[PDB]
Structures are given as structure tokens and as C-alpha cells.
Amino acid sequence: ASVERVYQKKTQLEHILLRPDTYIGSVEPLTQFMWVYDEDVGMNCREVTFVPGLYKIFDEILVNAADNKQRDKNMTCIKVSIDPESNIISIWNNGKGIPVVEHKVEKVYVPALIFGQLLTSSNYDDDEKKVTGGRNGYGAKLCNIFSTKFTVETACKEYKHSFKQTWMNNMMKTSEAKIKHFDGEDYTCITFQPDLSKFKMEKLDKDIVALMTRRAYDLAGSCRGVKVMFNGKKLPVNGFRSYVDLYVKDKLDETGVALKVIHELANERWDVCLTLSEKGFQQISFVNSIATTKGGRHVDYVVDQVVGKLIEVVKKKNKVSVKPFQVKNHIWVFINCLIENPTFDSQTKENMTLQPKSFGSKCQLSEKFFKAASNCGIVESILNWVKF
Amino acid sequence: ASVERVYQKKTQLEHILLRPDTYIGSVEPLTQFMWVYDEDVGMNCREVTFVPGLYKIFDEILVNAADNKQRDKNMTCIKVSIDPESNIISIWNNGKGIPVVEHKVEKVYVPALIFGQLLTSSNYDDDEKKVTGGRNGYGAKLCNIFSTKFTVETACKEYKHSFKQTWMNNMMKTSEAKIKHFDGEDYTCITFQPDLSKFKMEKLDKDIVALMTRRAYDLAGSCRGVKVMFNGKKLPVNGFRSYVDLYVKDKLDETGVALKVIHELANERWDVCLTLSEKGFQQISFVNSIATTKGGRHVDYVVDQVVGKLIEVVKKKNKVSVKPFQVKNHIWVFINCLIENPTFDSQTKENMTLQPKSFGSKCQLSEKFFKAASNCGIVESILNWVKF
């Protein structure tokens, strides 16, 4: 091999296709025990086989829709459609559209800039302490790159125009946008056909559909004031507590007693539910409507408070050593939070790494909550073990 | 705010400084209970306060040195030097240098291309099934960008020249490389002054030095056939088993009995040690001399085998239900492995996501190992709990 074959330089776009894992996660199948929303049983936990990168290109568009609630607090609705037979996914939102106007620096229409060029964002000025999920200026381009067809439609009454442009072949082909007069109610609709060959798949199968469907339920639970429709039907989730009910309302502990679920809305930015776990520590958490599936400092911040109080309660009855990991072993926690300018260690945003002092808010759980937590079976489980 | 202030485009280099977290990890301090190598006590586990991004720019250069063992199996030595007073870190290695020659496509000297331009690598051709840690073509440029001064020195007898070039001010300033006749023993030496202002630090303090020192011990344990010196003294670690001894040789279980440590070199590519944990699941693992501090599929692959066998052993004595998470709760596992073309979800490479079928090798632990594992106190801990 010559010097020129050994030492190589890649463009940004080449690098994304060669090294997808740091952008969208694995492009190979994964089997994981997790929660999905199935057609036959609804919410359930089971082994699911899916390609993480395909989940993530969908998630990028879904979180972008949720983010529009921050640009326009009047937004009320996100509509998700998935058709496996045609391989078409669409995500529609109301509230303000994207300005249909030429960017005076980049000399392209704003929607074409921010959906068709890498490293483009409205989230790069951190002096604005935003609680959007978007931070990096990649997500929508990543979906475009991993799609055989990707269509952006947006309508903005302030600029009196609508915009429609389609990209094809992994963002490598496009044509002139259609610009039309518009004076109605604003919306944005992203419609894409994922490039299943990039994921070694033949079709959107039941497992990936059940995971994408569950993310729509997550959003109905996490994004305050936004209703969610899936395949033309409103999702019957109206807030985080009703979302948590999908997991715990019909569940018993191993002794046959219904799980006792405690809840506190500490403030507008923090919603916490807690119950007993009998299968080790479990967390379900969202930051700015992102599913933080590896947790992060927001989970540790809430859990450490509970662990500290419950160690106190146990000690007032343990006349040996109860270590924090033993208490955490019995916690199932659910968190929905809004964090200013969050940081994560990857574009996939599974682990939120911002320190609590920078969150922009606190979640000081009340003494009422801690009293209730001392009665949900965790303390009992610990004390029974202080006999062994 | 105008359209042009709201919607912004960044260059790759601007994006790295604005969004460092996905490239090097957090640039804010973190406190974590972990292992470091201190001047007073050696290897120990304690709360450590450090900035992850500073750890990682050092790690990128250290792993690049280890990677040279794959380009030249005759390499024998890596030398690490850290001087807090002068703020100078150097990492030196022998074995083949970098070709001191003009790249015929990029029209620059090879060392200047691969240390001074983003997305440059000898690891972009995956038809070569390499067990280097390098994959993405960023690491050395990230260290350069986060340094106030960054010097590359390399000497390559095949090309009969040595090369020395210095960058300054976060890779924004450089000058003509010094090229000289060379006919001696090849080496590469990277010397840098980290830009502590990027990490809100005044000096390389004892905690970061203790972590960087420990990574040198890790390398002495993980990189087969390479001796490591730190600040002019050889590290007395000669393989993975002697490295593991730094953690377990002087440790007792809670009942006062020395930890029983089991070991198997399954093949050249897999070294595994196992003992009892009394503080929940613990793993120490390396992939291609990277510390996989969030684990990954290589950890799960080994642990699942042990868990499966130990559940069998317990059952042959449990005439209730013992779940895998309960067995894993008592495992402390140490893994050193070589994986072909590994994938990770972040440039920081904390979590290795490649599926076992793609590893390029297997680690089928022997029946002798599983018998020994049934005697290291894990089974006993589980059975004692089958009474409660």
C-alpha cells in the first residue's frame, strides 16, 4: 500500500456514511429487553430486535417537532404517520413554520440551509438559555443522509409563503424548491423514506414500528401542552402522570400487592414518579423530550436525594451497614425534566452530562414526597435484608 | 433577532470549540469515585475531581502510541512524561516512525496532514481487520485544538528524514516544519501544553495527574509486549495478570478472607480475571488499549457466560428464583481484549457497541475457569441469599 492509500482524508459527508456510529448509533441489529408499544398488547417490556441508527433518524425528526414548542408556545399538536408498506414516515407539527426567505449570508432559502447543509442550527447561541433538545446542528441532515427520499414542507404566514423541497439518494440529489403564496395556519411536515439498505433491512418490521410508536407516547407524556396523534388517532395520554400509568397502573410486586406509585411535580421543569423495583435499579427519563436511555446527571440528582432520605429512614430502624447501591437496587424512577443548554457525550443523546449547578432550576423534593417514598416498599425490602 | 442571527452555520473547527462534549467529553469538572494512581498510596479508589475533556486529549495521544504496535510489531516502549510546573506532557514511542514525505494527493507532508487537518487517518479502510483503537481520524487533532502548543516529532529511517513541526493557539498557528537527515532508530514524540483555560483550570493538579498516571499503568497491563515508563521510571507491570494484582492482591472480602481471583488467557486476544464484588457489579475493561469505562458488548459477552454457568451451579443447590441481575451484582470482572474494527457511540469510546459475531475472535471460557468461578464466593453469596 502506498502512502496515499494508507493515509486518507475524508469529507464530513463521507465520514458520516463510513462512521455512522458516532452520529446515529449502530447500523447493525441489536437485541435489547426494553419497552415498546405493540399492536396486540400496548405498552409492554420484551426483547426487541432493531437497528439503533434507524430509531435515531426518526427520533431526530420527532424531537425537532417537540422543539418547535419552544419557538412558538402556541403550538398544540404533533402528528406521526408510519406506513411500512410504502416505507413512508411523516412527522407534522403546528405552530410557527420556518421563515420562507433567502438567508442573506448563506444565499439559500432558510429551510434548504438547515435541512440540507451540515452544522446548521438555531441552537448555537447559548446566551439564550433554551430547553430545546437540539444542540448540534446535525439531526435533520442525518435523517436526510440516511433516507432515499426526504421532503421538507413548511408554511410561514409571517413571510406569506410556503416551501416544499425534496432530497433523494442520501441527500446527494435535490431540485428547485416550490415556493407558493401562503396565508393560512403555519405548519411543518417532514416526510421521509428511510434507506433500509443502510440498516440491512427489507422493511419497517413490527419491532421498529413498536419502538417508534412508543416514542410518540413518550412525547405525549413529556411535551407539555402538545397533543400527539399516531396514524390518525389521538394518543390518550395527557401529561406525565398518565404516561407513567402505562407502566405501573396494572403491576403487582412479587408478593401480589399493587405497586405504590408516588408523584411530585416539584416545579414546571421537574416531574418525578417513584415506585419499588424488584429487578434492580430502573430509570425512565426524558430531558427536553429526549429519551435519556443511559441516564445522566439529572437521574443521579433525583435518585441521590431519595437514597439519602431512605438511608435515614432505614437507620432509624437498623440498630448493619446499608450502602447506597443497595437502596438504588430497589428504585424504579420516572423523570421528565427541562434543562437549559444540556450537554451529552454523543449525538444520540442517551446520557446527559451537564452538572446540576448548570441546570437552570432545582428539583428539591418535598418532605411529603419523602414520607410517601418511605411507604412504597423500598424501606421494607431493605429492612428485610438487614436480617441477612 | 434577524434570520441571519437565528439560523447559523458553523465550520467543523468552530463546532469543536462550541460543542466539545461530543468530541472530548465534558469541559466542566466532574467528581467520580474511581481508581487513580497517587504519589502517596499508589493504586486506590477514591473520589476524584477532574475535567473529562482534559483526560481525553491525553488519552487520544496515549492510545495512538499503543496503536503503533500494530503498524510495527517490533515496537517495545512507550515513555510518558508529565511536568505540572511547566505544563508540558510528552508521549514517546519507538517502532516505525511516520513517513517524512509529501502526500501526493494532499500536497503536504504526511505528519502535517494527519496531525493538523481534521478527518485524516490510516484507519479508514475496514477491509483491513485491525485491532487498533483509532477509527475516526480526529483524536490527535482534538489534542492539538485543545493545546496552546503541540509539537510533533517523528523520524523514519525508510524515508531517511526526521520531521518536527509545532502548532500553537488551538491549532490556529504553525510554521514550516524542520526536515533533517535521519538514519537512526525510529521514534515518534508528541509534546503538548494543554490549554487549561478551555477546562477552567489553573494547573495540572494532583487528581488529573493521578488519573493520567493510572492510564500509563493501564497501558503497561493492556498492550502486549510494550514496556511503559512514567517520568523516567519503568512501570513494574509486565502483563494483564500483574496489572489486575494492583487492584485485588491485598483485598479482603467483608468477612476478612482474601479475594479469590480466577484468570484465563482464553487466546491471544482475550484475557479475563474474575473475583467477588460486595458493592454491586464492577467491570474494568480495555478494548485495543482503550479504557471502556461504560463497558460494552465485550463485557456483556464475557459476563453472560459466567452468569449462565453460575446460575446452573446455584440451581443444583437451590431446591427460589435467582435472576441474572442478582448474580451480576456479585461479579467483579477484568477484561483485556483485541477487537477487529470496533464501534463506539462516541469519539470518547467509553462504550464499545460492536456485536460479538463481528469481534473477529471468540472467548469461550473453559470448564476449568467456570469450576474455579464457582469457588470464588459468588455462589456462596447467592445461596446465602436464597435463605431470604
Ligand SMILES: Nc1ncnc2c1ncn2[C@@H]1O[C@H](COP(=O)(O)OP(=O)(O)NP(=O)(O)O)[C@@H](O)[C@H]1O
Ligand atoms: N419541525 C421544525 N419546526 C421548526 N424548525 C425546525 C423544525 N425541525 C427543524 N427545525 C430547524 O432546523 C434546524 C436544524 O435541525 P437539526 O439539524 O435537527 O439541528 P438542531 O435540532 O438545532 N440540533 P441537533 O438535533 O442536536 O443536531 C433546527 O435548529 C431548527 O431551527
Ligand SMILES: Nc1ncnc2c1ncn2[C@@H]1O[C@H](COP(=O)(O)OP(=O)(O)NP(=O)(O)O)[C@@H](O)[C@H]1O
Ligand atoms: N504515535 C504515532 N505513531 C505513528 N503514527 C501515528 C501516531 N499517532 C498518530 N499516528 C497516525 O496519525 C493518524 C491520525 O491520528 P488520530 O487523529 O488519532 O486518528 P486515528 O487514531 O486514526 N482515529 P481516532 O483516534 O479514533 O480519531 C493515525 O491514523 C496514525 O496513522
Ligand SMILES: CCCc1cc(=O)oc2c(C(=O)N3CCCc4ccccc43)c(OCCO)ccc12
Ligand atoms: C439504543 C436505543 C436504546 C433505547 C431506546 C428507547 O427508546 O428506549 C429504551 C428503553 C426504554 O424502553 N425506555 C422506555 C421510555 C424511554 C426511556 C427513557 C430512558 C430509559 C428507558 C426508556 C430501555 O429500557 C430498558 C428497560 O428499562 C433501554 C434502551 C432503550
Ligand SMILES: CCCc1cc(=O)oc2c(C(=O)N3CCCc4ccccc43)c(OCCO)ccc12
Ligand atoms: C469520563 C472518564 C471516566 C473514567 C476514566 C477512567 O480512566 O477510569 C474510570 C474508572 C476507572 O477507574 N477504571 C480503572 C481502569 C480503567 C477502567 C476501565 C473500565 C472501567 C473502569 C476503569 C471508573 O471506575 C469506576 C469504579 O470502577 C469510572 C470512570 C472512569
Ligand SMILES: [Mg+2]
Ligand atoms: Mg434536532
Ligand SMILES: [Mg+2]
Ligand atoms: Mg487516534
